[PDB]
Design a protein around this ligand. Structure first.
Ligand SMILES: [Cl-]
Ligand SMILES: [Cl-]
Lengths: 226, 228
């Protein structure tokens, strides 16, 4: 009933990071909390965009229906990540469907709660926009400086970012279907496997539904190498 | 100023706006030219405009506590800056100065802010666009980069040309360290990179770079060493 740990996780989302601190808790106080089993749908393409979504635990995939009826995976999101901001603010119908890929918990911020806040007080929207512009310039600068690295280094970094702590050993849940991560990391399915094999030597075991980092420092050291 | 207005539309600032309001905002622009070394603004002054570079290079810098210029950013043709500080009405954290002669478009802040105070739906619309772009940039930062330094330099150059075919010359600052910093490259490497780009028809002079063939430079950049 406090959702203290869960709100702490939500504060790392793009949505929550963009808000001025004075308004964070009041917005989180109006959250709609839900759990989903593996395979369960959060929403379907063309439905009304009733909320902004923040994954607290698990993996959620977004997919679009193609003209020939296949499902194209557009994104995969996990712990501490938000999605749906733009569609919610424009009030356009969902352009994708969303489905729990693992069992998961989501914090939903109802669209009217967030939109109405901004219709009421323009100072809030101006203030959030200021923050998002700064964040944009910052990401563009990171892209301009992004150097090449190895696929294994990408996967290490990814895995490191999924742990949150700086020391010890660790478990991280991963989807069964490994193509989801490959898409997210912009890698070939082979390359990801190749990448995994190479990480054995850095202390990483990759089971069917989870990965294990024997030691963070070693992995972190592997990621920060030639 | 239609050609100059066209270049401004490439900026982060103008891209993010509702298309149906652009022209009226662009209509209240103050256009200014700057000599090399001329100040655009200085640290602690009031942010009263958002700036878009129309031509040339502008560097932003802070003073180290021991009194040294520490360059923070360099902006060129079609790029905007000062959005956040102007919308927050806080003092400038840096100074800005023309590295080359330049043209810049200034958007008075009150023009922009009063529009949103009058109709918060404008800001709601702009914010939707800035969130979608944020997501796109974050997605792109997770995807494996494989390109070499010379390829990155190649892409940097290609993006400065704005034409898909033929030849172009792009103004570059005299001091190539400003580009090195922007690309997150050791100055050594930037030079090493320019050497390797000789093969793709890129000759780098004092105040400019000459691209003999765009398509050929795009080919080097896209390649997975290499040859003409
Ligand atoms: Cl399960
Ligand atoms: Cl004037």
């Amino acid at each position: 009933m406090a959702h203290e740990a869960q709100k702490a996780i939500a504060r790392n989302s793009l949505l929550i990071r963009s808000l001025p601190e004075q308004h964070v808790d009041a917005l989180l106080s109006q959250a709609v909390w839900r759990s989903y089993d593996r395979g369960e749908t959060l929403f379907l393409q063309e439905e009304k965009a009733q909320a902004i979504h923040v994954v607290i635990d698990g993996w959620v995939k977004l997919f679009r229906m193609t003209p020939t009826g296949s499902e194209a995976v557009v994104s995969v999101f996990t712990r501490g990540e938000s999605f749906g901001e733009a569609v919610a603010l424009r009030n356009t119908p969902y352009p994708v469907s969303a489905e729990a890929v693992t069992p998961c918990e989501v914090m939903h911020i109802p669209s009217p709660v967030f939109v109405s806040l901004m219709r009421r007080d323009p100072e809030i929207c101006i203030s959030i926009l200021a923050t998002t512009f700064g964040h944009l310039h910052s990401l563009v600068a990171q892209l301009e400086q992004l150097k090449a690295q190895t696929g294994a280094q990408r996967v290490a970094e990814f895995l490191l970012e999924l742990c949150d702590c700086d020391t010890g050993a660790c478990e991280v849940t991963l989807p069964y279907d490994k193509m989801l991560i490959a898409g997210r990391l912009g890698m070939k399915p082979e390359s990801l496997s190749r990448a995994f094999s190479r990480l054995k030597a850095a202390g990483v075991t990759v089971k069917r539904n989870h990965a294990e980092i024997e030691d963070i420092a070693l992995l972190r050291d592997y990621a920060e190498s030639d």
